[PDB]
Amino acid sequence: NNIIEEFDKLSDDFSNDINATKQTIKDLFLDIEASDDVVKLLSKYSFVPEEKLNIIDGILRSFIENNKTHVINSSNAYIYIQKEKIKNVCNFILKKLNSLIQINELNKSHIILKYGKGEAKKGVLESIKNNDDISKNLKSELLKYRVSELINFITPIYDDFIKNLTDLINDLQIKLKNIS
């Protein structure tokens, strides 16, 4: 009976984590928007990743609700094991998302360096200078650092980001089906 409450907890926790991720990515975009014409463009760009995360959040919540039915008349084994499986899927999604966040953190820094000029926000140069996680090659190429050009630069990066979010949604729908 409280089992339904526990599944509800799965949904709610997942929603919280997803909203946190959403805020992180929004912070990426906001940090990039420093720096009136390109700003509106980036703010437009920032709406699609939020939509993708709202999909992931909603797909999981929809799955759990429709799976409550199977939980009431099944063995305790199925309940505990299934709960475990759902937790695993959620953790998978969150791990992939966090990896994606790291990737686009480096992408953000790259964008700020190549175009934007804080230069207080372009104190990314010190973070790049101290970054021991990137190759010295990339470091070298980066420390050397109008609109149609910016579009030309961020279009592959942004399209790849949304593509990764789109395939992640596909992975989620596949993994949920395997336990559906």
Numbering used by the authors: 48 to 82, 88 to 197, 206 to 240
Sentences from the paper on this structure:
Two proteins from P. berghei, a rodent-infecting parasite, have been identified to be essential for host cell traversal by sporozoites. These are PbSPECT1 and PbSPECT2 (sporozoite microneme protein essential for cell traversal). In contrast to PbSPECT2, PbSPECT1 (∼25 kDa) has no detectable primary sequence homology to proteins of known structure or function.
Crystals of PbSPECT1Δ41 diffracted to 2.7 Å resolution, and its structure was determined by a combination of isomorphous replacement and multi-wavelength anomalous dispersion. The structure of PbSPECT1Δ41 revealed that it forms a four α-helix bundle with a ‘hook’-like feature at one end. Two PbSPECT1Δ41 molecules came together in a “V”-shaped arrangement, with a total of ∼1260 Å2 being buried at the interface. The asymmetric unit is constituted by two of these “V”-shaped, presumptive dimers that are then related by noncrystallographic translational symmetry. The segment leading from the “hook” to the α4 helix appears also to be flexible, as electron density for this region (residues 198–205) was visible in only one of the four PbSPECT1Δ41 molecules in the asymmetric unit; this electron density was sufficient for modeling only the main chain. In contrast, a striking and spacious cavity occurs in the interior of the structure proximal to the “hook”. Of further note, this cavity is juxtaposed against an unusually deep pocket (145 Å2 in area) on the surface of PbSPECT1Δ41.
